[PDB]
């Protein structure tokens, strides 16, 4: 049937992929050794040998430590040994290294592995890519890989779950350079990009889950929950099914505006589950509050272009219609005038599954919400500002130039980013 | 004598068809295995209208299930009443239209239409006296709208003198299920208005209203909505399978409902509709059925007929009744509500009576009205279309499939033309 291929690159991508594959194995009842103790999961797992299910995944990094952690973990006997590809020297937070110097050494091997995995599929629908903007390997190799993919396939859809840089929290100094360069070179080679912020997830964990020590495991578990809710309609059946193509058809009004924001509900802890009834109306309301968005940007500062809702479990379509109508009448949210109908809904029968030892309580229904809004324009502006601050004095430029990146490229990227900002300002004005 | 071929496109069409075939099989006394286990000879008297006959008493419904993605009818095959269908009638694609009208009309439909037409032709060759075709689809999705329009065009080319009925699901006025839903709808009508003999418009919001307010259902699912739609579908064509005092087949309904070729959109209804808590508080009679049929609340399209004037009306009664009662009820309704009927057509109503009641009910009635008020819905859609096409929103998705903006301009112009005609005739 329809098959999806997952690619995880860099430290963030690899760890998010680990969490995602643990979640899939738990949801489908597959043991960590590839055996089923007791079948629509052909979308993600292929059958090899006698009852062994191998995930359709590719794990790429230029540094072997995190992949080595994978190879010795609980899921050692789950992944194909050749699907875990490693380099020797990482990009070292240098976009040019992961794009021009180090990326080109293993890009061909990665493409060969992807082709071998894809030729098996008969109904391939698209690619899932997990990476981060700030990292060198992430941004550089992801940009190179998507350029190669768009050249090779073109028609198949390509999706990203990227980590947007936080407004205040940062873990690198060269972050704006890499972010701007990779956004400029990936703007024309993508179909939909869902972005999350570590700071926003920290706020979510502190405010709702009541966790004071949210390590990266919890963040990756939340992200994996969102990805699972996105792919559920493929992996199961419901009253209203949505595949990957409908996402880009409904959320992307123009080819240069494909940066929606992903939220989730209900994110509550075990003890507060007793005091709350998780009804469709209230979780739909919670999906639209600014305090629940997992990117540090206020929706009230802009207008929604398109919205997509995905419901799981015990859900009645009439309640969904009523809740969406109630949201529409409310004037706390704003919609562009040129988009009279701004909702795409999907309903699935399979309820979410709670990973044992986790932090989320057990619920019978859940909502995943994606919004394409101009409120992200502000974030773009901020990044550009930082770029300028560090480019008026040529700070750190020699590091990139010594790796084969001509200086004018930086200007090009900045110029393009400015144009993109103008784009948003043009579509945020009603007629 | 006559026989009807059923077509089934898209997810909405497939689910409605599954419910419809379950209802039909239960009506004729056929178990899910396809073996007749009824009690009355009238079940087999005209069973050839919908079911073939295979060696061994097994009955194969004369249906074709089409989709561009395999999930929906994979579930259909796995679930109950999946072994009843002949597996050669399941036509699947791998990609799926992705809510893109152009993709389902020019690229994927272009690939699947040859196989679908081969199946249709093979199924219809065994027909003795083909009466027409039935199609179930929705105007919002890509697969439904695009491939349905393509199939309808090809069939109308192949069988110009036959009958085509469509049970469409028109977009709701309050809450949409798709962002690009305006575009497709308009692009659909520009074909439908030219190729379909009659179309019955169904709105999900009206069905929600009926289920909540009248049936008192707290949790109405798509199962109940498709149950109601299947009840209407069965009521429409009941005169072809059972004897009655006054008969009416598809051709006669078409003759009575299209004063002009470009106006073939009607709003269906049903009666009686009561819950399991208040059904013993009301005695159902012909006046009760008539009063429930002529209720703006009971209409299955979210469009108030009181804002316009009826052109023609059809009432199909089921059960044992008195012709005098039906005639006096129609005369009374026409006299009281004479402000909602066009003056240039006397005796707007056409009645049919079928002796055999629905299995379990004492009596029932199906209402089909051709009101000018539908123009409202039409103009609303046009408005939204313009609100997008002024800014070229989502236009690249369609134009990357080979379509050009002149097609959108033509569709909008024809849409406005139809709205103007509906306004003039009022």
């Amino acid at each position: 049937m329809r098959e999806c291929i997952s690619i995880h690159v860099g430290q963030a991508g690899v760890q998010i992929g680990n969490a995602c594959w643990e979640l899939y194995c738990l949801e489908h009842g597959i043991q960590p050794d590839g055996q089923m103790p007791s079948d629509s999961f052909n979308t993600f797992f292929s059958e090899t040998g006698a009852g062994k299910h191998v995930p359709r995944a590719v794990f790429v990094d230029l540094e072997p430590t995190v992949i080595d952690e994978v190879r010795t973990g609980t899921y050692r006997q789950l992944f194909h040994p050749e699907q875990l590809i490693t380099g020797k020297e990482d990009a070292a937070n240098n976009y040019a290294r992961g794009h021009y110097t180090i990326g080109k050494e293993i890009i061909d091997l990665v493409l060969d592995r992807i082709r071998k995995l894809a030729d098996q599929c008969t109904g391939l629908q698209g690619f899932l890519v997990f990476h981060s903007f700030g990292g060198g390997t992430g941004s550089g190799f992801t940009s190179l890989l998507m350029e190669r993919l768009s050249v090779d396939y073109g028609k198949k859809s390509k999706l990203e779950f990227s980590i947007y840089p936080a407004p205040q929290v940062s873990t690198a100094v060269v972050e704006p350079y890499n972010s701007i360069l990779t956004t400029h070179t990936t703007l024309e080679h993508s179909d939909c990009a869902f972005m999350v912020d570590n700071e926003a997830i920290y706020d979510i964990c502190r405010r709702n889950l009541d966790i004071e020590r949210p390590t990266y495991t919890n963040l990756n578990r939340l992200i994996s929950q969102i990805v699972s809710s996105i792919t559920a309609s493929l992996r199961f059946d419901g009253a209203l099914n949505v595949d990957l193509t409908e996402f880009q058809t409904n959320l992307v009004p123009y080819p240069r505006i494909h940066f929606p924001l992903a939220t989730y509900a209900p994110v509550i802890s075990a003890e507060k589950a007793y005091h709350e009834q998780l009804s469709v109306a209230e979780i739909t309301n919670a999906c639209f509050e600014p305090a629940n968005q997992m990117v540090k940007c206020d929706p009230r500062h802009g207008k929604y272009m398109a919205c997509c809702l995905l419901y799981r479990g015990d859900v009645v379509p009439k309640d969904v219609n009523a809740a969406i109508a109630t949201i529409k009448t409310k004037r706390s949210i704003q919609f562009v005038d040129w988009c009279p109908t701004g909702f795409k809904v999907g309903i699935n029968y399979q309820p979410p599954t709670v990973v044992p030892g986790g932090d989320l309580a057990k619920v019978q229904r859940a909502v995943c919400m994606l919004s394409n809004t101009t409120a992200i324009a502000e974030a773009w502006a901020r990044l550009d500002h930082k770029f300028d601050l560090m480019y008026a004095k040529r700070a750190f430029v020699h590091w990139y130039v010594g790796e084969g990146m001509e200086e004018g490229e930086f200007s090009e990227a900045r110029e393009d980013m400015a144009a993109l900002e103008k784009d948003y300002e043009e579509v945020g004005v009603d007629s | 004598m006559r026989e009807i071929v059923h077509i089934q496109a898209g997810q909405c069409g497939n689910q409605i068809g599954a419910k419809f075939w379950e209802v039909i099989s239960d009506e004729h006394g056929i178990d899910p295995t396809g073996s007749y286990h009824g009690d009355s000879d009238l079940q087999l008297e005209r069973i050839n209208v919908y079911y073939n006959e295979a060696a061994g008493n097994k009955y194969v419904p004369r249906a074709i299930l089409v989709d561009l993605e395999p999930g929906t009818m994979d579930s259909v095959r796995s679930g109950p009443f999946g072994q009843i269908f002949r597996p050669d009638n399941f036509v699947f694609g791998q990609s799926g239209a992705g809510n893109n009208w152009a993709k389902g009309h020019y690229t994927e439909g272009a690939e699947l239409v040859d196989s679908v037409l081969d199946v249709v032709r093979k199924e219809s060759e065994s027909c003795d006296c083909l009466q027409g075709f039935q199609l179930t689809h929705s105007l919002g999705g890509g697969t439904g709208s695009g491939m349905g329009t393509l199939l309808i065009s090809k069939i109308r080319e192949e069988y110009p003198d036959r009958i085509m009925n469509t049970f469409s699901v028109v977009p709701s006025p309050k809450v949409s299920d798709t962002v690009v839903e305006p575009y497709n709808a308009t692009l659909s009508v520009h074909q439908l208005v030219e190729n379909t003999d009659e179309t019955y418009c169904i709105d999900n919001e009206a069905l929600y209203d009926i289920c909540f307010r009248t049936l008192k259902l707290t949790t109405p699912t798509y199962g109940d909505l498709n149950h109601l739609v299947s009840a209407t579908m069965s009521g429409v064509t009941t005169c072809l399978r059972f004897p009655g005092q006054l008969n009416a087949d598809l051709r006669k309904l078409a003759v009575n409902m299209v004063p002009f070729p470009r106006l073939h959109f009607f709003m269906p209804g049903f009666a009686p509709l009561t819950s399991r808590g208040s059904q013993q508080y009301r005695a159902l009679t012909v006046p009760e059925l008539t009063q429930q049929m002529f209720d703006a609340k009971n209409m299955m399209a979210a469009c108030d007929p009181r804002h316009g004037r009826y052109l023609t009306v059809a009432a199909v009664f089921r059960g044992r009744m008195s012709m005098k009662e039906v005639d006096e009820q129609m005369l009374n309704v026409q006299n009281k509500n004479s402000s909602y009927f066009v003056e240039w057509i006397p005796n707007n109503v056409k009645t049919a009576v079928c002796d055999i009641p629905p299995r379990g009910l004492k009596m029932s009635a199906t209402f089909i009205g051709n009101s000018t008020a539908i123009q409202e819905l039409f103009k609303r859609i046009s408005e939204q279309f313009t609100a997008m096409f002024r800014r070229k929103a989502f236009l690249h998705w369609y134009t990357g499939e080979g379509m050009d903006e002149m097609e959108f301009t033509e569709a909008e112009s024809n849409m406005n033309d139809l709205v103007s005609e509906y306004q003039q005739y009022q």
Binding site: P255, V427 | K392, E405
Partner: peptide, 10 residues
Amino acid sequence: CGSKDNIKHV
């Protein structure tokens, strides 16, 4: 983006 092209459409 060419969102201003068809604003003159009737």
